[PDB]
Amino acid sequence: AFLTVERMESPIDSADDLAKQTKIEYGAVEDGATMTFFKKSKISTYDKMWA
Amino acid sequence: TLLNSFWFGVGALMQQGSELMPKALSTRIVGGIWWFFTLIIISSYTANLA
Ligand SMILES: C=C(C)[C@H]1CN[C@H](C(=O)O)[C@H]1CC(=O)O
């Protein structure tokens, strides 16, 4: 178990893993099409990421 | 001899004890640290073999 068990993976792996884990802080750029994307989308995660 | 010294090193590498277990503490430390070498080499082999 101390030679091959696993690699220490990142706590986040996707968009919804940021949607739950409030320890890892978000981020985007002001005046951007990424910020505008979360401002104007509503599908169950990307409003929560803009919340 | 040089034949019997290499039959200690191959013997203690394969976990099969030989006929010539050393006396004379200076050679028991050589025999004792080659036992701990081949203990770790085999137990790392058979734990990674799966
Ligand atoms: C560097 C910035 C603000 C620009 C670069 N092109 C994108 C754009 O022009 O919309 C932006 C990146 C982003 O939206 O994250």
Side-chain angles (χ1 to χ4, degrees):
Chain A
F2 287 174
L3 296 175
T4 58
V5 63
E6 75 269 14
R7 178 66 178 86
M8 293 184 287
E9 294 293 328
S10 178
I12 59 171
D13 189 74
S14 65
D16 58 355
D17 290 331
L18 290 173
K20 295 186 287 184
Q21 296 178 357
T22 61
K23 183 258 181 65
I24 295 93
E25 187 179 3
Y26 290 92
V29 65
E30 186 177 1
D31 186 74
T34 301
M35 183 182 72
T36 304
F37 178 73
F38 292 99
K39 187 185 287 185
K40 293 180 174 66
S41 179
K42 64 183 181 293
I43 185 66
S44 70
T45 301
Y46 295 155
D47 194 1
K48 290 174 69 175
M49 293 178 71
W50 180 251
Chain B
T1 63
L2 193 279
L3 180 61
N4 288 319
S5 296
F6 185 74
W7 181 249
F8 184 78
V10 173
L13 182 66
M14 301 297 172
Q15 294 290 320
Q16 298 292 322
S18 296
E19 77 278 21
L20 50 89
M21 294 296 104
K23 296 179 177 66
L25 171 61
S26 66
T27 63
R28 290 183 183 271
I29 299 169
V30 175
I33 199 66
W34 181 255
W35 288 350
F36 182 75
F37 179 78
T38 62
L39 182 62
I40 300 299
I41 296 299
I42 296 171
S43 66
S44 297
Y45 178 76
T46 187
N48 200 4
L49 183 59

XYZ file of all heavy atoms in Angstrom:
810
model
N 0.812 -1.209 0.000
C 0.000 0.000 0.000
C 0.849 1.265 0.000
O 0.313 2.360 -0.185
C -0.943 -0.005 1.202
N 2.159 1.154 0.225
C 2.973 2.366 0.152
C 3.825 2.442 -1.096
O 4.775 3.232 -1.120
C 3.889 2.515 1.368
C 3.177 2.892 2.629
C 3.864 2.939 3.824
C 1.848 3.275 2.614
C 3.230 3.313 4.978
C 1.207 3.634 3.772
C 1.899 3.658 4.955
N 3.532 1.648 -2.119
C 4.231 1.753 -3.392
C 3.298 2.131 -4.533
O 3.625 3.019 -5.325
C 4.941 0.435 -3.716
C 6.058 0.030 -2.750
C 6.606 -1.338 -3.111
C 7.172 1.063 -2.697
N 2.139 1.468 -4.633
C 1.096 1.789 -5.612
C -0.260 1.748 -4.899
O -0.824 0.675 -4.680
C 1.111 0.818 -6.810
O 0.941 -0.529 -6.346
C 2.390 0.933 -7.647
N -0.786 2.917 -4.528
C -2.138 2.950 -3.976
C -3.007 3.960 -4.737
O -4.079 3.589 -5.232
C -2.104 3.141 -2.434
C -1.481 4.472 -1.947
C -3.476 2.886 -1.817
N -2.551 5.216 -4.870
C -3.099 6.232 -5.767
C -2.161 7.433 -5.780
O -1.200 7.517 -5.010
C -4.509 6.735 -5.380
C -4.595 7.690 -4.178
C -4.811 7.001 -2.850
O -4.637 5.772 -2.778
O -5.160 7.695 -1.872
N -2.461 8.368 -6.673
C -1.880 9.700 -6.688
C -2.793 10.656 -5.924
O -4.020 10.545 -5.978
C -1.686 10.168 -8.137
C -1.129 11.570 -8.328
C 0.296 11.695 -7.821
N 0.828 13.032 -8.064
C 0.662 14.064 -7.245
N -0.019 13.918 -6.117
N 1.177 15.245 -7.554
N -2.181 11.585 -5.186
C -2.959 12.598 -4.484
C -3.569 13.566 -5.488
O -2.900 14.488 -5.964
C -2.087 13.354 -3.482
C -1.594 12.520 -2.314
S -0.666 13.507 -1.122
C 0.862 13.780 -2.016
N -4.842 13.350 -5.804
C -5.550 14.105 -6.831
C -5.961 15.451 -6.252
O -5.958 15.638 -5.031
C -6.768 13.330 -7.331
C -6.434 12.045 -8.072
C -5.735 12.289 -9.396
O -6.015 13.322 -10.041
O -4.905 11.446 -9.793
N -6.303 16.384 -7.134
C -6.830 17.689 -6.765
C -8.205 17.517 -6.132
O -8.938 16.589 -6.498
C -6.898 18.586 -8.003
O -7.448 19.857 -7.718
N -8.587 18.367 -5.165
C -9.932 18.260 -4.580
C -11.033 18.645 -5.556
O -12.172 18.190 -5.426
C -9.873 19.221 -3.387
C -8.812 20.198 -3.742
C -7.788 19.422 -4.515
N -10.701 19.485 -6.540
C -11.655 19.792 -7.594
C -11.296 19.011 -8.855
O -10.127 18.699 -9.116
C -11.710 21.306 -7.861
C -10.340 21.842 -8.281
C -12.209 22.034 -6.634
C -10.365 23.274 -8.760
N -12.325 18.657 -9.630
C -12.110 17.914 -10.865
C -12.964 18.466 -12.006
O -12.665 18.203 -13.178
C -12.400 16.423 -10.628
C -12.002 15.548 -11.797
O -10.789 15.324 -11.985
O -12.902 15.082 -12.526
N -13.992 19.254 -11.698
C -14.891 19.770 -12.721
C -15.570 21.052 -12.256
O -15.129 21.678 -11.287
C -15.934 18.716 -13.096
O -16.782 18.429 -12.003
N -16.634 21.456 -12.952
C -17.327 22.689 -12.593
C -18.169 22.511 -11.337
O -18.283 23.434 -10.523
C -18.200 23.156 -13.756
N -18.770 21.330 -11.160
C -19.634 21.115 -10.003
C -18.826 20.868 -8.733
O -19.345 21.013 -7.621
C -20.613 19.968 -10.274
C -19.925 18.650 -10.609
O -18.684 18.603 -10.735
O -20.645 17.640 -10.746
N -17.553 20.495 -8.877
C -16.694 20.331 -7.709
C -16.266 21.685 -7.158
O -15.844 21.796 -6.002
C -15.483 19.470 -8.059
C -15.852 18.022 -8.291
O -16.838 17.558 -7.682
O -15.162 17.347 -9.079
N -16.359 22.730 -7.980
C -16.282 24.081 -7.442
C -17.630 24.542 -6.911
O -17.686 25.433 -6.057
C -15.776 25.058 -8.503
C -14.318 24.979 -8.939
C -14.083 25.911 -10.105
C -13.433 25.371 -7.784
N -18.727 23.950 -7.397
C -20.056 24.400 -6.990
C -20.385 23.969 -5.567
O -21.260 24.557 -4.921
C -21.113 23.884 -7.963
N -19.696 22.947 -5.059
C -19.939 22.483 -3.695
C -18.850 22.980 -2.750
O -19.136 23.537 -1.686
C -20.019 20.953 -3.676
C -21.196 20.383 -4.440
C -21.284 18.883 -4.241
C -20.184 18.169 -5.006
N -20.312 16.690 -4.906
N -17.590 22.786 -3.135
C -16.458 23.055 -2.259
C -16.181 24.549 -2.156
O -15.497 25.123 -3.009
C -15.223 22.314 -2.770
C -15.374 20.802 -2.727
C -14.166 20.073 -3.275
O -13.213 20.692 -3.742
N -14.204 18.746 -3.232
N -16.701 25.184 -1.106
C -16.511 26.610 -0.872
C -15.142 26.946 -0.287
O -14.852 28.128 -0.073
C -17.610 27.142 0.052
O -17.540 26.469 1.316
C -18.982 26.910 -0.565
N -14.306 25.942 -0.011
C -12.936 26.200 0.419
C -12.093 26.739 -0.730
O -11.388 27.741 -0.568
C -12.324 24.920 0.999
C -10.904 25.055 1.552
C -9.847 24.497 0.597
C -8.450 24.621 1.177
N -8.287 23.781 2.392
N -12.149 26.086 -1.887
C -11.415 26.527 -3.067
C -12.156 27.707 -3.675
O -13.349 27.615 -3.990
C -11.242 25.386 -4.087
C -10.362 24.255 -3.537
C -10.613 25.910 -5.362
C -11.100 23.107 -2.862
N -11.445 28.815 -3.840
C -12.025 30.100 -4.205
C -12.097 30.181 -5.727
O -11.190 29.711 -6.420
C -11.169 31.218 -3.612
C -11.685 32.631 -3.741
C -10.747 33.629 -3.077
O -9.686 33.202 -2.573
O -11.068 34.834 -3.042
N -13.159 30.799 -6.244
C -13.388 30.938 -7.680
C -12.512 32.017 -8.294
O -11.582 32.513 -7.657
C -14.837 31.311 -7.961
C -15.869 30.253 -7.710
C -16.501 30.163 -6.482
C -16.206 29.335 -8.685
C -17.457 29.223 -6.235
C -17.167 28.381 -8.451
C -17.784 28.332 -7.219
O -18.740 27.394 -6.953
N -12.807 32.390 -9.525
C -12.168 33.539 -10.115
C -12.439 33.651 -11.592
O -12.581 32.648 -12.290
N -12.494 34.893 -12.065
C -12.638 35.189 -13.484
C -12.110 36.591 -13.743
O -11.552 37.218 -12.839
C -14.092 35.064 -13.936
N -12.266 37.090 -14.948
C -11.744 38.408 -15.280
C -12.914 39.361 -15.494
O -13.983 38.979 -15.983
C -10.790 38.328 -16.498
C -11.519 37.915 -17.759
C -10.022 39.629 -16.702
N -12.741 40.602 -15.049
C -13.723 41.657 -15.249
C -13.551 42.172 -16.672
O -12.420 42.238 -17.168
C -13.539 42.769 -14.217
C -14.597 43.857 -14.244
C -14.400 44.886 -13.149
O -13.422 44.761 -12.381
O -15.226 45.817 -13.055
N -14.674 42.522 -17.319
C -14.788 42.776 -18.757
C -14.307 41.562 -19.543
O -13.244 41.585 -20.176
C -14.049 44.051 -19.184
C -14.288 44.395 -20.639
O -15.395 44.862 -20.969
O -13.369 44.173 -21.456
N -15.054 40.469 -19.451
C -14.707 39.279 -20.191
C -15.913 38.501 -20.657
O -17.012 38.659 -20.119
N -15.718 37.648 -21.663
C -16.799 36.785 -22.114
C -16.991 35.590 -21.197
O -17.979 34.865 -21.344
C -16.536 36.312 -23.541
N -16.066 35.364 -20.263
C -16.258 34.327 -19.257
C -17.174 34.825 -18.149
O -18.116 34.134 -17.747
C -14.906 33.888 -18.691
O -14.089 33.387 -19.754
C -15.086 32.800 -17.648
N -16.909 36.037 -17.646
C -17.782 36.671 -16.660
C -19.181 36.906 -17.214
O -20.169 36.717 -16.497
C -17.170 37.995 -16.204
C -17.952 38.725 -15.131
S -17.192 40.292 -14.685
C -17.571 41.246 -16.148
N -19.278 37.292 -18.489
C -20.573 37.489 -19.132
C -21.299 36.156 -19.314
O -22.535 36.103 -19.286
C -20.358 38.203 -20.472
O -19.642 39.421 -20.245
C -21.672 38.563 -21.144
N -20.543 35.062 -19.450
C -21.154 33.743 -19.599
C -21.841 33.294 -18.317
O -22.957 32.769 -18.358
C -20.106 32.718 -20.030
C -20.648 31.325 -20.167
C -21.470 30.988 -21.227
C -20.318 30.346 -19.245
C -21.971 29.704 -21.354
C -20.812 29.062 -19.367
C -21.638 28.741 -20.421
N -21.197 33.495 -17.165
C -21.826 33.092 -15.911
C -22.895 34.083 -15.477
O -23.818 33.716 -14.743
C -20.772 32.920 -14.819
C -19.861 31.754 -15.045
C -18.607 31.937 -15.592
C -20.262 30.470 -14.717
C -17.771 30.869 -15.817
C -19.425 29.394 -14.932
C -18.177 29.595 -15.481
N -22.794 35.335 -15.927
C -23.800 36.347 -15.607
C -25.120 36.045 -16.310
O -26.199 36.359 -15.798
C -23.276 37.735 -15.994
C -24.155 38.897 -15.575
C -23.606 40.211 -16.100
C -22.361 40.638 -15.350
N -21.900 41.981 -15.798
N -25.053 35.414 -17.480
C -26.245 35.238 -18.298
C -26.662 33.781 -18.474
O -27.624 33.513 -19.202
C -26.028 35.895 -19.661
C -25.912 37.412 -19.594
C -25.703 38.019 -20.969
C -25.725 39.540 -20.916
N -24.580 40.109 -20.160
N -25.981 32.831 -17.838
C -26.431 31.447 -17.897
C -27.154 31.079 -16.606
O -27.004 31.728 -15.567
C -25.262 30.502 -18.155
O -25.698 29.154 -18.188
N -27.958 30.019 -16.671
C -28.823 29.674 -15.553
C -28.938 28.170 -15.323
O -29.792 27.733 -14.547
C -30.214 30.267 -15.779
C -30.921 29.699 -16.999
C -32.267 30.360 -17.222
C -32.972 29.771 -18.432
N -32.260 30.097 -19.700
N -28.098 27.366 -15.973
C -28.308 25.922 -15.926
C -27.607 25.304 -14.710
O -26.508 24.740 -14.794
C -27.905 25.287 -17.283
C -28.216 23.780 -17.342
C -26.502 25.742 -17.792
C -29.690 23.457 -17.302
N -28.240 25.459 -13.542
C -28.095 24.659 -12.320
C -26.721 24.679 -11.648
O -26.586 24.204 -10.516
C -28.474 23.197 -12.591
O -27.533 22.537 -13.425
N -25.699 25.214 -12.313
C -24.379 25.309 -11.700
C -23.790 26.690 -11.936
O -23.147 27.276 -11.056
C -23.468 24.214 -12.266
O -24.051 22.930 -12.010
C -22.085 24.257 -11.629
N -24.051 27.246 -13.117
C -23.304 28.413 -13.568
C -23.953 29.689 -13.058
O -23.371 30.775 -13.149
C -23.212 28.389 -15.095
C -22.413 27.209 -15.633
C -22.634 26.729 -16.917
C -21.497 26.527 -14.829
C -21.938 25.635 -17.398
C -20.797 25.439 -15.304
C -21.024 24.996 -16.586
O -20.327 23.911 -17.059
N -25.170 29.569 -12.522
C -25.734 30.638 -11.711
C -25.184 30.559 -10.292
O -24.907 31.589 -9.666
C -27.262 30.533 -11.713
C -27.951 31.786 -11.189
O -27.269 32.771 -10.835
O -29.198 31.780 -11.127
N -25.007 29.337 -9.777
C -24.386 29.135 -8.472
C -22.922 29.550 -8.467
O -22.427 30.045 -7.449
C -24.507 27.671 -8.049
C -25.917 27.229 -7.709
C -25.960 25.733 -7.452
C -25.243 25.380 -6.160
N -25.365 23.933 -5.831
N -22.219 29.356 -9.585
C -20.856 29.866 -9.687
C -20.840 31.383 -9.811
O -19.837 32.019 -9.474
C -20.136 29.226 -10.874
C -19.881 27.736 -10.720
S -19.082 26.997 -12.157
C -17.439 27.693 -12.028
N -21.935 31.978 -10.286
C -22.026 33.433 -10.335
C -22.725 33.976 -9.091
O -22.686 35.180 -8.811
C -22.727 33.860 -11.627
C -22.879 35.335 -11.800
C -24.038 36.046 -11.732
C -21.830 36.295 -11.966
N -23.784 37.384 -11.904
C -22.434 37.563 -12.043
C -20.441 36.203 -12.081
C -21.698 38.730 -12.229
C -19.712 37.362 -12.264
C -20.341 38.609 -12.337
N -23.332 33.089 -8.300
C -23.825 33.485 -6.986
C -22.665 33.823 -6.056
O -22.800 34.636 -5.136
C -24.697 32.376 -6.395
N 36.219 -19.329 1.176
C 36.920 -19.112 -0.075
C 36.185 -18.054 -0.894
O 35.191 -17.473 -0.458
C 37.030 -20.413 -0.863
O 35.717 -20.876 -1.197
C 37.725 -21.473 -0.031
N 36.673 -17.805 -2.108
C 35.968 -16.866 -2.974
C 34.770 -17.548 -3.623
O 33.824 -16.883 -4.061
C 36.941 -16.283 -4.003
C 36.652 -15.059 -4.890
C 35.806 -15.334 -6.126
C 36.006 -13.962 -4.056
N 34.778 -18.880 -3.655
C 33.602 -19.628 -4.082
C 32.553 -19.672 -2.979
O 31.355 -19.518 -3.238
C 34.012 -21.041 -4.491
C 32.892 -21.956 -4.972
C 32.249 -21.373 -6.202
C 33.441 -23.339 -5.255
N 32.992 -19.880 -1.736
C 32.053 -19.989 -0.626
C 31.510 -18.628 -0.212
O 30.442 -18.542 0.401
C 32.719 -20.680 0.560
C 32.922 -22.158 0.329
O 32.054 -22.833 -0.220
N 34.061 -22.677 0.763
N 32.231 -17.551 -0.528
C 31.721 -16.223 -0.206
C 30.645 -15.799 -1.193
O 29.720 -15.066 -0.831
C 32.855 -15.205 -0.189
O 33.787 -15.502 0.832
N 30.744 -16.254 -2.442
C 29.716 -15.928 -3.421
C 28.530 -16.875 -3.303
O 27.446 -16.581 -3.813
C 30.321 -15.949 -4.826
C 29.381 -15.500 -5.909
C 29.058 -14.160 -6.049
C 28.836 -16.409 -6.799
C 28.194 -13.739 -7.044
C 27.975 -15.991 -7.798
C 27.657 -14.656 -7.919
N 28.700 -17.995 -2.601
C 27.574 -18.888 -2.349
C 26.844 -18.495 -1.070
O 25.726 -18.950 -0.809
C 28.071 -20.333 -2.312
C 27.026 -21.378 -2.074
C 26.885 -22.152 -0.961
C 25.926 -21.705 -2.929
N 25.801 -22.982 -1.095
C 25.190 -22.720 -2.291
C 25.504 -21.253 -4.179
C 24.062 -23.290 -2.861
C 24.378 -21.814 -4.739
C 23.671 -22.823 -4.081
N 27.444 -17.612 -0.274
C 26.699 -16.987 0.810
C 25.813 -15.878 0.266
O 24.643 -15.754 0.640
C 27.655 -16.438 1.867
C 26.963 -15.860 3.069
C 26.442 -16.690 4.044
C 26.820 -14.491 3.215
C 25.805 -16.164 5.149
C 26.182 -13.961 4.318
C 25.676 -14.799 5.283
N 26.363 -15.060 -0.625
C 25.653 -13.924 -1.176
C 24.517 -14.293 -2.104
O 23.521 -13.573 -2.173
N 24.650 -15.406 -2.825
C 23.558 -15.875 -3.677
C 22.534 -16.632 -2.841
O 21.321 -16.519 -3.055
C 24.113 -16.725 -4.835
C 23.007 -17.373 -5.640
C 24.925 -15.850 -5.757
N 23.007 -17.378 -1.846
C 22.142 -18.088 -0.924
C 21.260 -17.175 -0.097
O 20.043 -17.362 -0.050
N 21.849 -16.153 0.524
C 21.061 -15.222 1.320
C 20.239 -14.269 0.463
O 19.376 -13.566 0.995
C 21.969 -14.432 2.257
N 20.484 -14.222 -0.845
C 19.643 -13.437 -1.740
C 18.348 -14.177 -2.047
O 17.309 -13.559 -2.293
C 20.397 -13.129 -3.034
C 19.733 -12.274 -4.115
C 19.501 -10.849 -3.654
C 20.534 -12.313 -5.400
N 18.393 -15.506 -2.034
C 17.245 -16.304 -2.437
C 16.458 -16.842 -1.255
O 15.692 -17.790 -1.454
C 17.710 -17.477 -3.299
C 18.443 -17.088 -4.561
S 17.480 -16.146 -5.739
C 18.770 -15.721 -6.900
N 16.702 -16.317 -0.042
C 16.083 -16.681 1.239
C 16.444 -18.086 1.720
O 15.998 -18.500 2.794
C 14.555 -16.534 1.195
C 14.052 -15.116 1.037
C 14.288 -14.275 2.267
O 14.125 -14.743 3.388
N 14.684 -13.031 2.067
N 17.245 -18.821 0.955
C 17.629 -20.181 1.301
C 18.974 -20.141 2.011
O 19.991 -19.823 1.390
C 17.716 -21.051 0.052
C 16.416 -21.227 -0.718
C 15.380 -22.029 0.033
O 15.703 -22.992 0.725
N 14.121 -21.654 -0.124
N 18.976 -20.463 3.302
C 20.194 -20.371 4.082
C 21.227 -21.398 3.660
O 20.906 -22.522 3.280
N 22.489 -20.992 3.726
C 23.601 -21.785 3.239
C 24.194 -22.614 4.381
O 23.649 -22.651 5.490
C 24.624 -20.856 2.581
O 24.061 -20.226 1.446
N 25.319 -23.280 4.117
C 25.910 -24.234 5.047
C 26.979 -23.588 5.917
O 27.575 -24.259 6.766
C 26.517 -25.408 4.276
C 27.877 -25.129 3.597
C 27.805 -24.421 2.245
O 26.794 -23.762 1.933
O 28.780 -24.536 1.474
N 27.226 -22.292 5.729
C 28.409 -21.625 6.255
C 28.098 -20.302 6.949
O 28.775 -19.304 6.694
C 29.431 -21.470 5.123
C 29.083 -20.878 3.742
C 29.208 -19.373 3.539
C 29.903 -21.602 2.708
N 27.100 -20.293 7.845
C 26.724 -19.164 8.695
C 27.932 -18.612 9.445
O 28.602 -19.352 10.174
C 25.635 -19.584 9.681
C 24.294 -19.935 9.046
S 23.470 -18.558 8.218
C 23.748 -18.915 6.483
N 28.257 -17.326 9.254
C 29.550 -16.801 9.710
C 29.701 -16.703 11.216
O 28.759 -16.345 11.925
C 29.593 -15.402 9.082
C 28.650 -15.457 7.946
C 27.553 -16.359 8.394
N 30.895 -17.024 11.704
C 31.331 -16.659 13.043
C 32.018 -15.309 12.926
O 31.852 -14.617 11.918
C 32.269 -17.714 13.631
C 31.595 -19.056 13.832
C 32.544 -20.090 14.396
C 31.815 -21.397 14.650
N 31.355 -22.026 13.380
N 32.772 -14.936 13.972
C 33.738 -13.838 13.896
C 33.120 -12.482 13.568
O 33.177 -12.071 12.405
C 34.847 -14.155 12.885
N 32.557 -11.812 14.599
C 31.632 -10.661 14.549
C 31.800 -9.709 13.365
O 30.803 -9.179 12.863
C 31.793 -9.862 15.846
C 31.142 -8.490 16.046
C 29.668 -8.541 15.947
C 31.546 -7.901 17.386
N 33.034 -9.469 12.918
C 33.277 -8.648 11.736
C 32.622 -9.230 10.483
O 32.266 -8.494 9.559
C 34.779 -8.493 11.532
O 35.370 -9.740 11.217
N 32.449 -10.556 10.432
C 31.743 -11.150 9.300
C 30.266 -11.367 9.599
O 29.479 -11.598 8.675
C 32.381 -12.474 8.903
O 32.266 -13.401 9.985
C 33.829 -12.267 8.610
N 29.867 -11.310 10.872
C 28.444 -11.387 11.187
C 27.738 -10.082 10.856
O 26.528 -10.073 10.614
C 28.230 -11.742 12.655
C 28.607 -13.157 13.041
C 28.284 -13.406 14.504
N 28.690 -14.729 14.963
C 27.919 -15.807 14.897
N 26.704 -15.723 14.384
N 28.366 -16.972 15.340
N 28.472 -8.970 10.844
C 27.875 -7.697 10.460
C 27.701 -7.631 8.946
O 26.711 -7.084 8.448
C 28.723 -6.536 11.008
C 28.756 -6.604 12.530
C 28.157 -5.189 10.610
C 29.760 -5.684 13.151
N 28.639 -8.214 8.192
C 28.488 -8.314 6.740
C 27.337 -9.247 6.393
O 26.508 -8.949 5.525
C 29.801 -8.787 6.093
C 29.623 -9.000 4.608
C 30.883 -7.790 6.325
N 27.259 -10.379 7.081
C 26.167 -11.303 6.879
C 24.863 -10.765 7.418
O 23.795 -11.109 6.914
N 24.930 -9.905 8.432
C 23.707 -9.385 9.020
C 23.112 -8.238 8.230
O 21.901 -8.021 8.256
N 23.950 -7.489 7.514
C 23.451 -6.342 6.760
C 23.104 -6.766 5.337
O 22.388 -6.068 4.612
C 24.476 -5.192 6.797
C 23.825 -3.860 6.441
C 25.623 -5.447 5.842
C 22.818 -3.398 7.452
N 23.582 -7.939 4.925
C 23.139 -8.508 3.661
C 21.823 -9.255 3.840
O 21.071 -9.455 2.883
C 24.230 -9.414 3.091
C 23.877 -10.036 1.789
C 23.526 -11.326 1.582
C 23.789 -9.387 0.518
N 23.249 -11.537 0.258
C 23.401 -10.357 -0.416
C 24.009 -8.082 0.079
C 23.229 -10.066 -1.761
C 23.851 -7.800 -1.259
C 23.456 -8.783 -2.162
N 21.512 -9.650 5.073
C 20.197 -10.217 5.343
C 19.125 -9.141 5.343
O 17.989 -9.388 4.925
C 20.200 -10.956 6.675
C 20.939 -12.230 6.646
C 21.430 -12.858 5.550
C 21.303 -13.034 7.768
N 22.068 -14.013 5.913
C 22.005 -14.141 7.274
C 21.099 -12.925 9.144
C 22.505 -15.133 8.100
C 21.600 -13.909 9.963
C 22.291 -15.000 9.440
N 19.460 -7.938 5.807
C 18.475 -6.864 5.817
C 18.346 -6.234 4.439
O 17.300 -5.670 4.103
C 18.838 -5.813 6.864
C 17.841 -4.698 6.969
C 16.624 -4.896 7.593
C 18.119 -3.452 6.436
C 15.703 -3.874 7.684
C 17.202 -2.428 6.526
C 15.994 -2.640 7.151
N 19.405 -6.305 3.632
C 19.310 -5.877 2.241
C 18.331 -6.746 1.469
O 17.379 -6.245 0.866
C 20.686 -5.918 1.579
C 20.676 -5.504 0.136
C 20.602 -4.174 -0.214
C 20.724 -6.451 -0.871
C 20.587 -3.797 -1.538
C 20.710 -6.080 -2.194
C 20.640 -4.753 -2.527
N 18.531 -8.065 1.508
C 17.725 -8.962 0.689
C 16.336 -9.166 1.274
O 15.463 -9.746 0.623
C 18.427 -10.302 0.538
O 18.565 -10.907 1.825
C 19.792 -10.093 -0.044
N 16.111 -8.712 2.502
C 14.768 -8.719 3.059
C 13.949 -7.617 2.408
O 12.776 -7.814 2.089
C 14.807 -8.539 4.575
C 13.462 -8.567 5.288
C 12.803 -9.906 5.087
C 13.652 -8.283 6.757
N 14.571 -6.459 2.185
C 13.845 -5.310 1.655
C 13.694 -5.418 0.142
O 12.675 -5.006 -0.423
C 14.547 -4.008 2.085
C 14.579 -3.919 3.609
C 13.860 -2.780 1.535
C 13.223 -3.894 4.256
N 14.682 -6.013 -0.532
C 14.621 -6.161 -1.988
C 13.521 -7.138 -2.389
O 12.774 -6.899 -3.344
C 15.995 -6.583 -2.540
C 17.027 -5.492 -2.277
C 15.941 -6.871 -4.018
C 16.703 -4.184 -2.943
N 13.368 -8.226 -1.634
C 12.342 -9.212 -1.968
C 10.965 -8.723 -1.542
O 9.983 -8.884 -2.275
C 12.688 -10.575 -1.348
C 13.970 -11.102 -1.968
C 11.590 -11.588 -1.573
C 14.486 -12.291 -1.280
N 10.869 -8.073 -0.383
C 9.557 -7.650 0.096
C 9.082 -6.389 -0.618
O 7.911 -6.013 -0.508
C 9.582 -7.441 1.606
O 10.425 -6.365 1.953
N 9.968 -5.724 -1.361
C 9.522 -4.678 -2.277
C 9.183 -5.270 -3.635
O 8.336 -4.742 -4.364
C 10.592 -3.603 -2.427
O 10.834 -2.948 -1.198
N 9.868 -6.353 -4.002
C 9.538 -7.084 -5.218
C 8.150 -7.700 -5.139
O 7.301 -7.443 -5.997
C 10.586 -8.163 -5.465
C 10.320 -9.011 -6.672
C 10.555 -8.527 -7.945
C 9.842 -10.306 -6.536
C 10.314 -9.302 -9.049
C 9.596 -11.089 -7.634
C 9.833 -10.582 -8.887
O 9.588 -11.364 -9.986
N 7.894 -8.509 -4.109
C 6.639 -9.247 -4.036
C 5.454 -8.374 -3.650
O 4.312 -8.827 -3.761
C 6.758 -10.406 -3.049
O 5.576 -11.209 -3.121
C 6.913 -9.897 -1.634
N 5.691 -7.142 -3.195
C 4.597 -6.219 -2.927
C 4.242 -5.385 -4.144
O 3.113 -4.894 -4.236
C 4.949 -5.300 -1.760
N 5.179 -5.213 -5.075
C 4.924 -4.533 -6.334
C 4.584 -5.516 -7.446
O 4.176 -5.092 -8.529
C 6.158 -3.708 -6.738
C 5.849 -2.608 -7.751
O 4.703 -2.376 -8.124
N 6.892 -1.937 -8.210
N 4.719 -6.819 -7.191
C 4.509 -7.812 -8.238
C 3.038 -7.956 -8.603
O 2.721 -8.409 -9.703
C 5.096 -9.155 -7.795
C 5.092 -10.375 -8.716
C 5.844 -10.103 -9.993
C 5.730 -11.532 -8.007
N 2.128 -7.533 -7.723
C 0.701 -7.739 -7.968
C 0.181 -6.835 -9.082
O -0.851 -7.123 -9.699
C -0.086 -7.512 -6.678
C -8.182 39.034 -21.305
C -9.502 39.172 -21.461
C -10.332 39.949 -20.496
C -10.232 38.618 -22.634
C -9.320 37.930 -23.659
N -10.348 37.440 -24.627
C -11.616 37.193 -23.904
C -12.659 38.048 -24.566
O -12.214 38.895 -25.367
O -13.848 37.899 -24.244
C -11.319 37.536 -22.429
C -10.935 36.397 -21.497
C -12.089 35.924 -20.634
O -13.225 36.296 -20.965
O -11.835 35.194 -19.658
